[PDB]
Design a protein around this ligand. Structure first.
Ligand code: ZN
Length: 257
């Protein structure tokens, strides 16, 4: 089964998931000089005041903080989107060292980690139907650099001890994801895919230009998680990122000059 190791990592995925070599795969390098400013892009609308987190889960690839998506409580709209996308979960990808970890890169620069807030298009009714559509998902990506702590991340960091291994979950209510956003909502946007199997080409990517700062102590705690299940040989959950894939026939647009 797929993973991030030498024998099952990203360069192997195409054997079970041939769309791995497809025309709109993610992540990509964002060449800031080639990205075109598009003055017709609208500001992003992030409406998370009524978000309802429920649970946090180690799924063997990362940890997801899951949200109640049975009603329009935490939605992303505007920007390049038509319609309303509901938050279902967020998770991160990170490195074994601060020098790598992000999925997207910016002029080939790798950040220490990258946060993905995953939303699905409500016109498709549920997440499972949405992934089958080219405009099914909107993922808001936010880079993390190591420096000052992010106060709004600490509640997430502090519960990781309780979900160390694959398949463990913990109650995780009343978490406010507004505490993970940078000051500016300037963004790059392009059409792409999920970045793990099934690698479906159903995502409008919206990657914020401004990274958030997290402390070394915070990201160190990410790296104590495990890929493996309980009572199995310990493999640290580190370097759970897919590298940049060919841009091919796409253009990345910028919301800002
Ligand atoms: Zn992700």
């Amino acid at each position: 089964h797929w993973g991030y190791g030498k024998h099952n990592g990203p360069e192997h995925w195409h054997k079970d998931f041939p769309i791995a070599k497809g025309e709109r795969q993610s992540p990509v390098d964002i060449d800031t000089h080639t990205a075109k400013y598009d003055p017709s892009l609208k500001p992003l609308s992030v409406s998370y005041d009524q978000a309802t987190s429920l649970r946090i889960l180690n799924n063997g690839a990362a940890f997801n903080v899951e949200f109640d998506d049975s009603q329009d409580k935490a939605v992303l709209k505007g920007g390049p989107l038509d319609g309303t996308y509901r938050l279902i979960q967020f998770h991160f990808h990170w490195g074994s060292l601060d020098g790598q970890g992000s999925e997207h890169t910016v002029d080939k620069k790798k950040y220490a980690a990258e946060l993905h807030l995953v939303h699905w298009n409500t016109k498709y009714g549920d997440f499972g139907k949405a992934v089958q559509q080219p405009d099914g998902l909107a993922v808001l990506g936010i880079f993390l650099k190591v420096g000052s702590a992010k106060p709004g991340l600490q509640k997430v960091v502090d519960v990781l001890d309780s979900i160390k291994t694959k398949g463990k979950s913990a109650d995780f209510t009343n978490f406010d994801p507004r505490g993970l956003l940078p000051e500016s909502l300037d963004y790059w946007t392009y059409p792409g895919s999920l970045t793990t199997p099934p690698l479906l080409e159903c995502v409008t990517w919206i990657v914020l230009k401004e990274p958030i700062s997290v402390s070394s102590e915070q990201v160190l705690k990410f790296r104590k998680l495990n890929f493996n299940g309980e009572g199995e040989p310990e493999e640290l959950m580190v370097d759970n990122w897919r590298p940049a894939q060919p841009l091919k026939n796409r253009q990345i647009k910028a919301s800002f000059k």
